[model samples]
Target chain A: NLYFQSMMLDRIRVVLVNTSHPGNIGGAARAMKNMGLSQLVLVQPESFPHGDAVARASGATDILDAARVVDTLEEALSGCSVVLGTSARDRRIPWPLLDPRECATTCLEHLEANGEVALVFGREYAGLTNEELQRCQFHVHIPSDPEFGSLNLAAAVQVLTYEVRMAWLAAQGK
Target chain B: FQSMMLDRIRVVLVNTSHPGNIGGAARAMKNMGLSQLVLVQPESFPHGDAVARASGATDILDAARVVDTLEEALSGCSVVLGTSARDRRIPWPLLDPRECATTCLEHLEANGEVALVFGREYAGLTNEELQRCQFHVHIPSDPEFGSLNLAAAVQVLTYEVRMAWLAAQGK
Candidate 1:
């Protein structure tokens, strides 16, 4: 059991929804790989087969090829014990919002208990729909200038991934 | 000589949301040999994306000062210069990045501390915010069209500061 545990890699699933640019999708994958995350799921991506994605993805093409594509958010959330929705834009929804660091800490709890967790990223133009966000147990906002919170989609993913890794490391007591 | 100018310059970013920008800001600070970073209500840090964006400058990420408010962030700074790219509604004195750099150097030389302030991604700074600062610095870009990233803005100001320091050394 000790030898088997040594080979275990932490599992993190990221769901990037309605991605318009394949380059961003690839960029997202590249970001995940850098942080030691492998599970990537895409929902209705646009222009994924084009060259721009591979170009931007750099060396993380395997993550793109193995990505799971789903028809809907519900189908995507199946069997996941925890779900986090990422938002940069303020929706004025009464949902309890956790900043990236706090969300990462919460995510750590679930992962340490051997539970499946999924983080959801929405479209570039409008962000996650309220309906899509409702499915999440809690809303996680990345807190930018309320007026011009124009952060790139992939950049958002990178922030959360770091938080999660930090939380995981804390849980491991490292 | 290493003790000289160390932590003398305090660079503050107000209402920063992205950790990556903070990371980039740290790189700008490191390039300029500034050792102090104070963040005003940053949304995220130790963010995976910020570290990736920061490249090899994780030490800045690890040691960044996170504060709840701008006032608190600037409390230790002796002289403050709020950075603005646009003019505010109330008429306030303005200096170019180079002039602001010189002003800060002078202030630091006279006083024990100096701070160059920047507002959030949306509005550079409000008049109310500017009132807290003794001076204001603006980077004069193209009058027709001018937009500078946070790191680029910091780079311009830091370069000016470096020049002043070099001149002071008679280099």
Candidate 2:
């Protein structure tokens, strides 16, 4: 009795930019893997194939093993028609903002119509730079606590993946 | 906005093995504007790791209620929802996280105290523990790799509750 749509899962790619901690990278992979999204793209990470990362991955190495490490953000976004960048806070530029739930709906529509889409996450400290965020058509915000909204990078990925999974399940009507 | 209604909902952790998870859960709770926290037989408390992990949300940890049993934790609560990742051999009433939020607000609106329970990291809740709750709430994770971090699961549910609360408040 499974109702999860697998095709939409294949069209989503989780892209990390300038990530410093290998363990966070591993954690993000595990989060993506847990939600049935396999493709992982890392841009200029401080380190990869790290033991700490492997330990945090917790048998999700298939995701880590097959992860793509690219040098530039452009390289990571290659072949991606729809790009959505995750921003924990607003930037100087007035980019279009979509809540995490709405982003999932848009992702499903694009993934069904387009070839592939990328969900881009920026550095752990400052999040996506204005230039990096501008490249994306939509900016996704999770609407965290105003006083203390510093969500962990991996946790942010988990929230979005969870939303996507729920939307997919709801679509199946089972 | 019924801020008082939101205060009536409590988050309970049962037999938690790690103090860090406790701290993480507290931080997650505060991020969603949830304040009440209860620990049922945690492995450690007043832990440095938990304090460090809590970031700046130490008030939640300081005001946390510690008890010896799940029943003690559930005392004075009218409705209880336990978070379960794996499906059990025996089926019980089930509510997805969204449904859990709607039900929780309904109970709270009726002036009844509510509890959202989370099980241990590895084993989750026992059958007896599962039966203690009125309904089971699942996050609907990936079937192929449905392993969810305990603190992460708390974040997801707390996030949903906060969203629902906001919608109800018209804010």
Candidate 3:
């Protein structure tokens, strides 16, 4: 077997639950494609097929055009063997927590095993609900300043996807 | 002194073409606990699009230092790292975002002010602009579609800085 054997980028999907801004969806798609992650599953987006999304996607429109829109988060997670939800640190959750880098390792491990993985993001204002957080096996925090943790939705997606790319590179001995 | 290292790090944007990118970069810096933002010869500042895109990071915009030239912006910086992704040869040290963070950590440890410089959107940092820096940082974006949004580029570099800072803190 080749030394770089692992799950392809297609096996991992980015899930956005109840996204409020369509521009963010476009930006998220752009970040995903830039990092080689293609699957995008949207759960009840407030606005799709809007000019803002097209305007912000920045030539990564194919991701938006091929996006899968679903009625519920459960539907979005279906067929995914693993899920990692993005959550703030002080959210009073007892679930196992991981920094973005740690989350990347777990993702690569599952992907190497031929398991489908999902990275879940929640509403901009009201992050993931406790119920939604419970659906994932682990929570990923980006280590933002607790005083001003104002990371934009798209930027958050960029950082995590970036970690995945870095980890993937390490696995391939790059 | 170690706790305040992040505040001493400066983010310099030279000759930016988009105002929203400034706001987005400010947001990215604040998200990673950085506050110093310097803009040199921006096309426009204090614009509606910037405020709209800042998204709760307006305080950084208000505090950003606007200057007339790159030299003026780099004042008081002991170490400077310019962002470039060209395949051409360079005599100076070149590093990826992760290694850039390692160097930043060392510089910050000595209480030296550090600057992370970025350039125009369509085109990257000019030769003269990059020459001002002792080192260059290049984000390893996919070469096929290697065009990273200016703000997103800021996010990745600042994100790596935060990771290194956290690691250095033994957190």
Candidate 4:
């Protein structure tokens, strides 16, 4: 069970696009590991391998150590088949816009079929661009307050990844 | 009208050792449209780390209720749900995060006030504190590393509460 579940988690990659803060990068790493995720891909982070990132990772520096830094979203998402882009409600997007739980269900469905999934996050302020959102198979919106709806990048990671862990556990009959 | 329902919910932290975790929790709560916050015997409040971590959600920290006891913090909360870390001594049945959210909404509609309790980061809730709640909620994690960071735990529970709330609103 460990090997099977671990393989599925490993195949799922978390992609961050043009993140501003090094602390957020670190925070995202910690959140990913907390939810039993390990693979991380950062596309054009402001500053990588910074001290702030290490400090914020808390104890999960291995995820940071193994993380790959790429220049383009295409390159970052090279191996992924099912990509999920995080969005805010301000964007009246078109397509299967899933909330966190639905995104997890979609992720688990793909993972069970032995397909790689990518959970993509965009910049801290603007989020994923129209172009980036277009690239993903599904758009994931964390249902937050319309007035104060912007979630921290890492907290967003925690929410989605937490949903993934919950979905996986339920699948295992926990 | 739906937004007003969130106002009645309160997130209580008991004897928190780290102020930054307080800030993180505030951000999480406010992001979910939950406005009320209560601190029972915090080691420190209005802390620089908390302020730094809270970012733009400082309004929540500013409006937080700092109290001397759990009773005072939970005075008006008709339903209390305490989060228990997994692998605890208690073998009792527990609500998963989703179930906890359902319980919160049920109570919120019935009486309109609910408190979700979180304990210290290192030691978690005491037996006496657990006795104070009508329901016990546990977030499942990898048994190898079951203990989640304080703010992370708060994020999971509050996110679920927000999910449940949005479902009720027919979204």
lDDT of 4 by residue, B1-171 (tens): 788888888999998888988998998888888888899999988799899778688999999989988888888788999985533655456888899999898888855799999998778888778888888887776665536777777888888888888777787
Model 4: share of native contacts present? Answer: 0.56
Ranking by lDDT: 3, 4, 2, 1
Worst 10 residues of 3 chain A by lDDT: A1-10
Greater-lDDT candidate between 1 and 4: 4
The docking quality of candidate 2, as DockQ, is 0.58
List iRMS for all predictions: 14.7, 1.4, 1.2, 1.5
lDDT of 3 by residue, B70-127 (tens): 9999999999998853535747756989999999889986678999999888777778
lDDT of 1 by residue, A110-130 (tens): 765667788999997578887
Give every collision pair in model 1. A158-B49, A162-B48
The true-versus-predicted C-alpha distance at residue B61 of model 2, in Å, is 2.3
Model 2 clashing residue pairs (backbone): none
Error of 2 at B123 (Å): 0.3
Candidate 2 lDDT tens digits, A101-167: 9888988888667558899988876888877887898899887778888776777788888888877
lDDT of 3 at B56: 88
Cα lDDT, model 2, residue B80: 93
Better of 3 and 4 by DockQ: 3
DockQ for each of the predicted structures, in order?
Answer: 0.03, 0.58, 0.73, 0.62
lDDT of 2 by residue, B1-171 (tens): 476676788999998877877887888888787889999989999899789657688999999999999999999999999986555747876788889989888898668999999999877988888889998888776665656777778888888887798887685
Off by over 4 Å in 3: A1-7, A91-94, B85-93
